[PDB]
Amino acid sequence: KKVKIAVDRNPVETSFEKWAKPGHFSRTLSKGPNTTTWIWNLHADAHDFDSHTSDLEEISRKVFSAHFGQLGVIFIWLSGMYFHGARFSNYEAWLSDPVHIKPSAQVVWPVVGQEILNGDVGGGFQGIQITSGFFQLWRASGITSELQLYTTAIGGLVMAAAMFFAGWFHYHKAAPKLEWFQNVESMLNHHLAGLLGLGSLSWAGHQIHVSLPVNKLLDAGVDPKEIPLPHEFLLNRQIMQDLYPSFAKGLAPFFTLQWGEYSDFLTFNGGLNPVTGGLWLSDTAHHHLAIAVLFLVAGHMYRTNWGIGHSMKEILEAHKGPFTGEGHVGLYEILTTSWHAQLAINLALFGSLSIIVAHHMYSMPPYPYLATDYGTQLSLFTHHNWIGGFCIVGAGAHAAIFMVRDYDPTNNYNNLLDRVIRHRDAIISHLNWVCIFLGFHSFGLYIHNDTMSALGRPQDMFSDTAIQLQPVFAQWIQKTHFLAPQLTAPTALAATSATWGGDVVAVGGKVAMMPISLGTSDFLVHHIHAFTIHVTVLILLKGVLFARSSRLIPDKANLGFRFPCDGPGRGGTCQVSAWDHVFLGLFWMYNSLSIAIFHFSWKMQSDVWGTVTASGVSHITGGNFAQSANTINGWLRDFLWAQSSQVIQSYGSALSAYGLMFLGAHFVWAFSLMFLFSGRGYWQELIESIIWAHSKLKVAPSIQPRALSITQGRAVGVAHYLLGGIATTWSFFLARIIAV
Amino acid sequence: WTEPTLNPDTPSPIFGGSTGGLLRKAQVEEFYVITWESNKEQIFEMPTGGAAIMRKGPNLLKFARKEQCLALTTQLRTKFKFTPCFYRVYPSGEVQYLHPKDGVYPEKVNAGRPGVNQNFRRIGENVNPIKVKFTGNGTMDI
Amino acid sequence: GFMFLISWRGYWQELIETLVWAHEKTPLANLVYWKDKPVALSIVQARLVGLTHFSVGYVFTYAAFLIASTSGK
Amino acid sequence: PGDFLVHHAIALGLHTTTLILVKGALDARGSKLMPDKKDFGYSFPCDGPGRGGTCDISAYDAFYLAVFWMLNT
Amino acid sequence: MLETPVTSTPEVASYLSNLPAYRTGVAPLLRGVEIGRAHGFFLPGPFIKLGPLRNVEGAAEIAGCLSAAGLVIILAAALSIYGSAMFQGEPRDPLQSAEGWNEFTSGFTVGALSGVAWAFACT
Amino acid sequence: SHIVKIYDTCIGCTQCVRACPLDVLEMVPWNGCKANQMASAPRTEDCVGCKRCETACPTDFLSVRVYLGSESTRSMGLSY
Amino acid sequence: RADGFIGSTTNLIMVASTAAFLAAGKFGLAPTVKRGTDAACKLVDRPNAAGLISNDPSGFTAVDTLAFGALGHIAGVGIVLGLRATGNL
Amino acid sequence: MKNFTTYLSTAPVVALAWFTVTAALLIEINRFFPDPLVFS
Numbered sequence A: 001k002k003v004k005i006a007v008d009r010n011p012v013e014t015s016f017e018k019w020a021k022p023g024h025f026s027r028t029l030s031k032g033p034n035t036t037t038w039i040w041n042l043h044a045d046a047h048d049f050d051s052h053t054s055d056l057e058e059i060s061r062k063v064f065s066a067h068f069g070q071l072g073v074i075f076i077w078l079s080g081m082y083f084h085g086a087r088f089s090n091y092e093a094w095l096s097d098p099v100h101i102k103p104s105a106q107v108v109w110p111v112v113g114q115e116i117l118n119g120d121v122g123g124g125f126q127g128i129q130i131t132s133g134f135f136q137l138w139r140a141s142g143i144t145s146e147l148q149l150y151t152t153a154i155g156g157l158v159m160a161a162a163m164f165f166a167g168w169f170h171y172h173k174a175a176p177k178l179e180w181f182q183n184v185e186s187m188l189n190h191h192l193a194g195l196l197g198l199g200s201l202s203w204a205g206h207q208i209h210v211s212l213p214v215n216k217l218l219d220a221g222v223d224p225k226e227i228p229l230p231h232e233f234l235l236n237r238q239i240m241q242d243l244y245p246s247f248a249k250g251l252a253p254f255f256t257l258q259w260g261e262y263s264d265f266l267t268f269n270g271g272l273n274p275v276t277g278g279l280w281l282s283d284t285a286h287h288h289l290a291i292a293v294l295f296l297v298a299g300h301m302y303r304t305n306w307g308i309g310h311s312m313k314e315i316l317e318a319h320k321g322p323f324t325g326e327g328h329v330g331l332y333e334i335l336t337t338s339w340h341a342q343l344a345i346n347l348a349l350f351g352s353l354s355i356i357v358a359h360h361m362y363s364m365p366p367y368p369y370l371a372t373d374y375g376t377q378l379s380l381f382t383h384h385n386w387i388g389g390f391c392i393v394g395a396g397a398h399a400a401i402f403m404v405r406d407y408d409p410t411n412n413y414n415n416l417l418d419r420v421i422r423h424r425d426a427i428i429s430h431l432n433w434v435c436i437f438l439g440f441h442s443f444g445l446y447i448h449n450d451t452m453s454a455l456g457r458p459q460d461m462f463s464d465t466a467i468q469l470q471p472v473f474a475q476w477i478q479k480t481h482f483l484a485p486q487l488t489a490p491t492a493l494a495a496t497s498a499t500w501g502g503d504v505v506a507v508g509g510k511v512a513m514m515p516i517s518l519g520t521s522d523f524l525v526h527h528i529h530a531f532t533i534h535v536t537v538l539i540l541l542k543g544v545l546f547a548r549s550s551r552l553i554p555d556k557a558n559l560g561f562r563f564p565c566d567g568p569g570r571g572g573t574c575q576v577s578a579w580d581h582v583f584l585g586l587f588w589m590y591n592s593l594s595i596a597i598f599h600f601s602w603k604m605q606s607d608v609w610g611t612v613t614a615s616g617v618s619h620i621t622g623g624n625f626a627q628s629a630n631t632i633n634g635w636l637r638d639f640l641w642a643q644s645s646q647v648i649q650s651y652g653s654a655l656s657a658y659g660l661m662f663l664g665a666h667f668v669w670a671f672s673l674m675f676l677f678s679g680r681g682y683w684q685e686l687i688e689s690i691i692w693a694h695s696k697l698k699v700a701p702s703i704q705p706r707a708l709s710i711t712q713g714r715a716v717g718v719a720h721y722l723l724g725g726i727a728t729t730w731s732f733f734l735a736r737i738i739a740v
Numbered sequence B: 001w002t003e004p005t006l007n008p009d010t011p012s013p014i015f016g017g018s019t020g021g022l023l024r025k026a027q028v029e030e031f032y033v034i035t036w037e038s039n040k041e042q043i044f045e046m047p048t049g050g051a052a053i054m055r056k057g058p059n060l061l062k063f064a065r066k067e068q069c070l071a072l073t074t075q076l077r078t079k080f081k082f083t084p085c086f087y088r089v090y091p092s093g094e095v096q097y098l099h100p101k102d103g104v105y106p107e108k109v110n111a112g113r114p115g116v117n118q119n120f121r122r123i124g125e126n127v128n129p130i131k132v133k134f135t136g137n138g139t140m141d142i
Numbered sequence C: 001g002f003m004f005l006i007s008w009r010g011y012w013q014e015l016i017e018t019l020v021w022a023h024e025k026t027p028l029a030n031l032v033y034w035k036d037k038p039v040a041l042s043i044v045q046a047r048l049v050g051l052t053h054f055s056v057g058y059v060f061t062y063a064a065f066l067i068a069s070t071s072g073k
Numbered sequence D: 001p002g003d004f005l006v007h008h009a010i011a012l013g014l015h016t017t018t019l020i021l022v023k024g025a026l027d028a029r030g031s032k033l034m035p036d037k038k039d040f041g042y043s044f045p046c047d048g049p050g051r052g053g054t055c056d057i058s059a060y061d062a063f064y065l066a067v068f069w070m071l072n073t
Numbered sequence E: 001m002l003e004t005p006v007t008s009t010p011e012v013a014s015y016l017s018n019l020p021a022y023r024t025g026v027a028p029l030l031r032g033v034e035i036g037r038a039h040g041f042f043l044p045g046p047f048i049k050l051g052p053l054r055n056v057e058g059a060a061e062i063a064g065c066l067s068a069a070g071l072v073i074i075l076a077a078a079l080s081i082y083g084s085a086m087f088q089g090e091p092r093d094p095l096q097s098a099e100g101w102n103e104f105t106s107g108f109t110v111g112a113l114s115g116v117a118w119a120f121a122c123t
Numbered sequence F: 001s002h003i004v005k006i007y008d009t010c011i012g013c014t015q016c017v018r019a020c021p022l023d024v025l026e027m028v029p030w031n032g033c034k035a036n037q038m039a040s041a042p043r044t045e046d047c048v049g050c051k052r053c054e055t056a057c058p059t060d061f062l063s064v065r066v067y068l069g070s071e072s073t074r075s076m077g078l079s080y
Numbered sequence G: 001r002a003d004g005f006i007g008s009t010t011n012l013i014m015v016a017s018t019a020a021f022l023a024a025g026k027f028g029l030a031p032t033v034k035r036g037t038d039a040a041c042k043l044v045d046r047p048n049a050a051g052l053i054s055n056d057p058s059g060f061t062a063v064d065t066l067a068f069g070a071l072g073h074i075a076g077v078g079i080v081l082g083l084r085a086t087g088n089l
Numbered sequence H: 001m002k003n004f005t006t007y008l009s010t011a012p013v014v015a016l017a018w019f020t021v022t023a024a025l026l027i028e029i030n031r032f033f034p035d036p037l038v039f040s
Ligand code: CLA
Pocket: A012, A013, A014, A015, A016, A017, A018, A019, A025, A061, A062, A063, A065, A066, A068, A069, A164, A165, A166, A167, A168, A171
């Protein structure tokens, strides 16, 4: 019960002998290759540590070390960004004129006429307009030169080497024992206070000493190459005192509890900076300060080696009621003896967080000169939404993996886990019904508007001009948060975001953030999102509940997670596994997220993004979302077809790379329909004829060529299908928004 | 061995109930009844969904599919090394001893089993479909 | 047509099983019942059903273009 | 020269669609994976997950697949 | 299948037993006029307020109850063919019998159209 | 019901029997193999057409053959 | 604590809060290393895994002098700023 | 080193090398002899 560091000295030896023996990890693939399938198998089974061995000590050590490498490659990527933004970038030129200069940090070699990709991003630079929001991130970090980027890049590379070293050291040298990994109370206590709490406080230090004075001077008009370097603010109190008089007192107000005096670098203004169009840096500093105290205190809840504290096992068991049988008693062990259970829960919240971050960041642009960079905003919102949607699908997959691999019917008697597996046909049935309802009562009022418009009856349509369906509930929450600062949140000088309502923030004659108005089309598109979200959940949840068994095939648990079909009998049993419920829940995720990114792309270009002219603002599309989005044709004529002009006509210009990728993406998406619509039977025999030709000329390969497995073809098709569609939108969005 | 007779008053395992068991078919069409004899009270996994505590000595569980009963049969024969036997209760009460229907579980050879559906030719010695055209008889069966 | 080609018989079959349970349990609706047991489309059947949808589309989508673009001018 | 490329593309469709149908016709009653295909008739879903995968092994599925290439051509 | 607080509350297991379908004992025709009027009176609503001629004067209620009558008649034919395709062998509750359904259908057709008329006489 | 046929190419491995999910196959005595056993299919009325037995037949081609034919409640494995 | 604020209402409030909360653990009026609590907020005692050795007669351990005073510090800050925001301070 | 060289011989590594050389050769050829439409 003692929380202590437990390690095993020099377990795995460091040698390349295993490197030369492909498949040493699997008993089955160690015997070498005899068919061309082994090649695809040694990759589809290299990270499945649970399959390699039954010891949970080794599986954990492998997982812990793996994560290290991941961090390493993340550092390498980050360091490369700073380096490319240090040597091959226009960051310094952009700093002087952020509005009229487009960010660029990728220069192509002058060959095969590919030098056309080096467009005039302005600022004596010819490169590729980036949409990663790094320039505005560095600006809000204070970075005012390419020597602070070069140093950072070097530091990231050094960290990378530490990460890989740590992975090898904590695997081949000091490998932690299982008892170490299963101290969840300790992990949470150190990840909440030490990682999140200190991580925010440490940032609240930079933001208060480097980012705030540098950004204030930059917004004051001071030349970037004339601002005092960051360290001078720390050492020279006079400089910081001039910018923030509260540094004349010192740390005395804090200890004297007179925090108020510091109300010049720690404020609750709210809204957006009128100069740069991004959340005040002062408010961000106060947020990270508060967030820190919260996390740091939260780190003192779970019990460790002393006495004070809580026992998550006891808490879960204590929470049981008159309807949920034994209650949460039995989940603690599941979540301290399974990596698939933990991963599933982690991915779900982590993925959902990514979407939530995208909504908040775009609504309240956190970086200077970010909202007026429309390409960056769009590229970020679309990105995080996908990155998150994928994780959620993974959460469903690993959940099913645990159910078919780590579930023990003995530990879960009357748990809320057995009591849910015991009513799966009520959960699934009701969810199926709501999906059908939401379907007809969301996509139907779109076909109805199409038919009524085509029949020349446009007064019999569902629009703000005819049968209206305004989102009243969403319209009231918008007003409770716009008039909140005057009542609910007095200390706040302004509302959290302009989206709720108010004036239009303009920076450089462009709309940084404009109050968004929700109408019939917003109501219609929002319910469309709900229908998709519900369906996606139905497919993944269905796979998890019946991952072990069902009226059709009452032994799936003994068949596995990645098994194609029980057989051609029972009227056909294809895609009965939980991998095939994840396979299909990916297409719906693409369908669900695609509409969301299209909804953001069109709504914004139509109702927010534009140029503030004398008396009025000119939106990218002249405010046509309301009347043009209630029909499916409007989504094709006024969105797809109309906005596709930039990408289809990008050839010959710096944006020509997107036109090429736009088509290339169509090819990949369509190519995927040869594996999603076909079957090995046809390819296997076809290969037999090819082998014959090879065996005639005596050029037949020693390894037996075999067609892709049933599950493999399903994976290859879905992979190319998602890659193609997302790539098409990536080219469309980027070339549209960068051109306009 | 004598085809065991069903005792429909056999203690049934402990289980709260599931929305995943018998439907109208059980009465309108037919259902099946697996029975076994435990050594201790143990939790097993139901081939329909969930967990149940088997009782000591005689146990009796009813399903609407033979595969479900046989699934539990293998589970008991492997996880608990039991020797379960199941029948088929028709709507009229006609119980038919389905497994093993011989005493010796199918896998094991036992004299007294006739050969049914046994073609004595290589699978590649079957006639052409044209030889059985308009005969309404399969090439394999012919 | 894609659903009948991308998706296969199994997720639908098990889904139909849940639907059968719900109807038999639903009151006032349990009175009305199906004469034929609801089953998912056959493996070969779905292949032709999806292909008919796929073909019909390719024909109507083009017939529309070929006629409305040629006539429009 | 624009017609040259499209004409060769039409040839590709003619040859491929043909290859799909011809392969199915020749392997209609024979194949290393399914040497008894004639005994299983023309339209059969598959021979099971045995031998890796027998999905779409019937000569009905050479038609089913050839239709897509025919529409593409 | 899992006796839940919802599917057992004696109040709701009694509400269901007074509805003219679980009230076995009332002659199937009288268990059809009851259900028919109940399902028939509320039918006109959706057509009167949201139908094609919903914004015309006076002819917005005649057109709703005329349309309702139409559907009522359509519902009747489906009820009839159902009994013909379910009681081929004329399968306790006489409603669940060949003659039982033919008298329930008729009670519904004469009760629903009476309800549709009650709703027009209530406008 | 599906048609299951055991050809003379049987080695009496009993693997197909220990593979049937609905007790359709059994091992009867024979003289053409050194294991003096040949799988029979007594109850093809319970065959679902899973073809698990074929996936368990080790002999060249397949000694056991499941010819999916007529479909019933048992053949379709329907618990409705 | 600076600029000789000693004697100031803030000093008195913080001192009172820290003391009132250390004398709520040394005097068994709240959870402590040993004598923890329950699902009904009743001290049901507790075994500490390090087995802290305290000379204090009641057994108050350093873990408990840095876990009750911290509560007093947070409470004092909340009260000081709260009264400060109001007319109370 | 015998086993490191064995790893550097595996298909993925050898293909990565062969292709890189071939790609670089074509790139360098166009770098010195650009716009090679005809063999003249
Ligand atoms: C640097 C020296 C070194 C050496 C000689 C070895 C040697 C060995 N390691 Mg090891 N390891 C190292 C470093 C090293 N390791 C480091 C730094 C880490 C931390 C990440 C690990 C973590 C690790 C784990 C978790 C495991 C091993 C295992 C093993 C043994 C067999 C597996 C193997 O390595 O085959 C060769 C494997 C590869 C060549 C794969 C390379 C993967 C590396 C880490 C990164 C590749 C990611 C790639 C870039 C992703 C992007 C691809 C994309 C660009 C297309 C073997 C004796 C396994 C074992 O113990 O035996 C069962 C085992 O499970 N190692």
